[PDB]
Scaffold this motif. Structure first.
Motif, PDB file in Angstrom:
ATOM      1  N   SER A 108       0.822  -1.218   0.000  1.00 37.39           N
ATOM      2  CA  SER A 108       0.000   0.000   0.000  1.00 37.39           C
ATOM      3  C   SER A 108       0.853   1.264   0.000  1.00 37.39           C
ATOM      4  N   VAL A 109       2.121   1.110   0.351  1.00 32.95           N
ATOM      5  CA  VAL A 109       3.036   2.236   0.383  1.00 32.95           C
ATOM      6  C   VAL A 109       4.360   1.781  -0.213  1.00 32.95           C
ATOM      7  N   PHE A 110       5.012   2.635  -0.997  1.00 33.92           N
ATOM      8  CA  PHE A 110       6.299   2.260  -1.577  1.00 33.92           C
ATOM      9  C   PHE A 110       7.302   2.198  -0.424  1.00 33.92           C
ATOM     10  N   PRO A 111       8.046   1.083  -0.298  1.00 30.97           N
ATOM     11  CA  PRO A 111       9.052   0.848   0.752  1.00 30.97           C
ATOM     12  C   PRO A 111      10.128   1.923   0.836  1.00 30.97           C
ATOM     13  N   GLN A 112      10.115   2.683   1.926  1.00 30.10           N
ATOM     14  CA  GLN A 112      11.085   3.746   2.138  1.00 30.10           C
ATOM     15  C   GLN A 112      12.521   3.220   2.019  1.00 30.10           C
ATOM     16  N   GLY A 113      12.780   2.044   2.581  1.00 29.01           N
ATOM     17  CA  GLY A 113      14.118   1.477   2.511  1.00 29.01           C
ATOM     18  C   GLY A 113      14.543   1.163   1.083  1.00 29.01           C
ATOM     19  N   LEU A 114      13.592   0.707   0.269  1.00 24.53           N
ATOM     20  CA  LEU A 114      13.872   0.378  -1.130  1.00 24.53           C
ATOM     21  C   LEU A 114      14.155   1.675  -1.875  1.00 24.53           C
ATOM     22  N   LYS A 115      13.386   2.709  -1.566  1.00 26.38           N
ATOM     23  CA  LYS A 115      13.588   3.997  -2.215  1.00 26.38           C
ATOM     24  C   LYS A 115      15.015   4.482  -1.965  1.00 26.38           C
ATOM     25  N   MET A 116      15.467   4.392  -0.716  1.00 23.63           N
ATOM     26  CA  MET A 116      16.816   4.832  -0.358  1.00 23.63           C
ATOM     27  C   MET A 116      17.893   4.046  -1.099  1.00 23.63           C
ATOM     28  N   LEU A 117      17.704   2.738  -1.206  1.00 26.06           N
ATOM     29  CA  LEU A 117      18.662   1.893  -1.911  1.00 26.06           C
ATOM     30  C   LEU A 117      18.735   2.308  -3.386  1.00 26.06           C
ATOM     31  N   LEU A 118      17.577   2.415  -4.034  1.00 27.66           N
ATOM     32  CA  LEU A 118      17.540   2.787  -5.442  1.00 27.66           C
ATOM     33  C   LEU A 118      18.129   4.172  -5.705  1.00 27.66           C
ATOM     34  N   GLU A 119      17.898   5.107  -4.789  1.00 27.02           N
ATOM     35  CA  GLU A 119      18.429   6.455  -4.961  1.00 27.02           C
ATOM     36  C   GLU A 119      19.863   6.574  -4.436  1.00 27.02           C
ATOM     37  N   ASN A 120      20.417   5.464  -3.947  1.00 29.15           N
ATOM     38  CA  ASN A 120      21.786   5.438  -3.422  1.00 29.15           C
ATOM     39  C   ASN A 120      22.777   5.398  -4.588  1.00 29.15           C
ATOM     40  N   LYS A 121      23.475   6.506  -4.827  1.00 30.41           N
ATOM     41  CA  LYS A 121      24.440   6.590  -5.927  1.00 30.41           C
ATOM     42  C   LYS A 121      25.666   5.697  -5.751  1.00 30.41           C
ATOM     43  N   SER A 122      25.902   5.229  -4.532  1.00 32.35           N
ATOM     44  CA  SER A 122      27.051   4.374  -4.258  1.00 32.35           C
ATOM     45  C   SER A 122      26.903   2.968  -4.832  1.00 32.35           C
ATOM     46  N   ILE A 123      25.665   2.511  -4.958  1.00 32.83           N
ATOM     47  CA  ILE A 123      25.392   1.172  -5.471  1.00 32.83           C
ATOM     48  C   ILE A 123      24.870   1.238  -6.901  1.00 32.83           C
ATOM     49  N   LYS A 124      25.568   0.574  -7.819  1.00 34.89           N
ATOM     50  CA  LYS A 124      25.155   0.558  -9.217  1.00 34.89           C
ATOM     51  C   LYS A 124      24.070  -0.487  -9.448  1.00 34.89           C
ATOM     52  N   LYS A 125      23.216  -0.226 -10.428  1.00 36.19           N
ATOM     53  CA  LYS A 125      22.140  -1.143 -10.792  1.00 36.19           C
ATOM     54  C   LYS A 125      22.320  -1.447 -12.273  1.00 36.19           C
ATOM     55  N   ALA A 126      22.620  -2.705 -12.594  1.00 30.52           N
ATOM     56  CA  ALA A 126      22.840  -3.107 -13.976  1.00 30.52           C
ATOM     57  C   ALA A 126      21.627  -3.797 -14.578  1.00 30.52           C
ATOM     58  N   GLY A 127      21.225  -3.324 -15.750  1.00 38.64           N
ATOM     59  CA  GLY A 127      20.080  -3.893 -16.421  1.00 38.64           C
ATOM     60  C   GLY A 127      20.097  -3.566 -17.898  1.00 38.64           C
ATOM     61  N   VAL A 128      19.043  -3.987 -18.587  1.00 35.47           N
ATOM     62  CA  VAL A 128      18.876  -3.760 -20.017  1.00 35.47           C
ATOM     63  C   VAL A 128      17.586  -2.968 -20.195  1.00 35.47           C
ATOM     64  N   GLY A 129      17.689  -1.811 -20.841  1.00 38.65           N
ATOM     65  CA  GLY A 129      16.530  -0.958 -21.027  1.00 38.65           C
ATOM     66  C   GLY A 129      16.216  -0.360 -19.671  1.00 38.65           C
ATOM     67  N   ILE A 130      17.259  -0.214 -18.853  1.00 38.03           N
ATOM     68  CA  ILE A 130      17.111   0.302 -17.500  1.00 38.03           C
ATOM     69  C   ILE A 130      16.772   1.798 -17.396  1.00 38.03           C
ATOM     70  N   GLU A 131      17.078   2.584 -18.424  1.00 39.34           N
ATOM     71  CA  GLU A 131      16.725   4.003 -18.367  1.00 39.34           C
ATOM     72  C   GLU A 131      15.201   4.113 -18.395  1.00 39.34           C
ATOM     73  N   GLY A 132      14.563   3.231 -19.159  1.00 40.78           N
ATOM     74  CA  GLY A 132      13.111   3.235 -19.235  1.00 40.78           C
ATOM     75  C   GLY A 132      12.542   2.930 -17.861  1.00 40.78           C
ATOM     76  N   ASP A 133      13.219   2.046 -17.135  1.00 36.36           N
ATOM     77  CA  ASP A 133      12.797   1.682 -15.790  1.00 36.36           C
ATOM     78  C   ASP A 133      12.898   2.903 -14.883  1.00 36.36           C
ATOM     79  N   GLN A 134      13.947   3.694 -15.077  1.00 34.25           N
ATOM     80  CA  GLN A 134      14.143   4.890 -14.275  1.00 34.25           C
ATOM     81  C   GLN A 134      12.969   5.839 -14.488  1.00 34.25           C
ATOM     82  N   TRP A 135      12.671   6.124 -15.749  1.00 29.59           N
ATOM     83  CA  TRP A 135      11.564   7.017 -16.087  1.00 29.59           C
ATOM     84  C   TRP A 135      10.268   6.537 -15.449  1.00 29.59           C
ATOM     85  N   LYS A 136      10.002   5.246 -15.587  1.00 26.06           N
ATOM     86  CA  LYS A 136       8.787   4.649 -15.057  1.00 26.06           C
ATOM     87  C   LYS A 136       8.667   4.761 -13.538  1.00 26.06           C
ATOM     88  N   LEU A 137       9.753   4.478 -12.820  1.00 27.89           N
ATOM     89  CA  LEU A 137       9.746   4.570 -11.361  1.00 27.89           C
ATOM     90  C   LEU A 137       9.485   5.992 -10.913  1.00 27.89           C
TER      91      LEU A 137
END
Length: 186
Positions: A73-102
């Motif tokens: 019912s609520v977006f996980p605050q901890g997950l938000k922090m991880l995703l917005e954490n510039k120290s940890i890279k996230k590798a994917g394919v078509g991942i910019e689209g994922d960024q826009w969507k999130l």
């Protein structure tokens, strides 16, 4: 006949915000600047659009996390922090689209994403229009299960089926393995 790529580790399934936040903080705790996690997201296929239902983070060959946000019912605050954490890279394919969507769906800004198709073009010295499966075949010599049956299933249904779990986990896993392969080539 190319072997099928499959995530061989433990799949952690989290469908509650608190649990998800705790796990995400745990992930951030065990990693440091420069580390990478395999990343991908899933969502179900008249006037309304479909929002992200699942976010997958593969931290290793032995562990992949499936965060079923459509069941939260609520977006996980901890997950938000991880995703917005510039120290940890996230590798994917078509991942910019994922960024826009999130951003559009939850105002969550994915930081430090790594577009594997770009890395592949530069590393392999080519200019191809890739697909995750094509990248898996060429880079890993493996094949990915990609039948509509699961790829286009209703990802917002709770609970996720066993096939849905393995598919979603395997996609984030491919991102992790491809990243390591291209990043350590000789």
């Amino acid at each position: 006949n190319l072997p099928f790529l499959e995530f061989p580790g433990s799949i952690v399934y989290s469908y509650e915000a608190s649990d998800c936040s705790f796990l995400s903080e745990d992930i951030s705790m065990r990693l440091s600047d420069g580390d990478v996690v395999g990343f991908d997201m899933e969502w179900p296929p008249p006037g309304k659009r479909s929002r992200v239902a699942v976010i997958q983070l593969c931290v290793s060959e032995s562990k992949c996390y499936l965060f079923h946000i459509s069941s939260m019912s609520v977006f996980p605050q901890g997950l938000k922090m991880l995703l917005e954490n510039k120290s940890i890279k996230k590798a994917g394919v078509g991942i910019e689209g994922d960024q826009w969507k999130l951003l559009r769906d939850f105002d969550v800004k994915l930081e430090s994403f790594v577009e594997l198709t770009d890395v592949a073009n530069e590393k392999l010295k080519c200019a191809e229009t890739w697909s995750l499966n094509g990248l898996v075949k060429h880079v890993l010599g493996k094949q990915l299960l990609k039948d509509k049956s699961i790829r286009c299933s209703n990802w917002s249904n709770f609970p996720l089926t066993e096939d849905q779990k393995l598919y979603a986990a395997t996609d984030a896993y491919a991102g992790l393995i491809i990243y390591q392969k291209l990043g350590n080539l000789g």
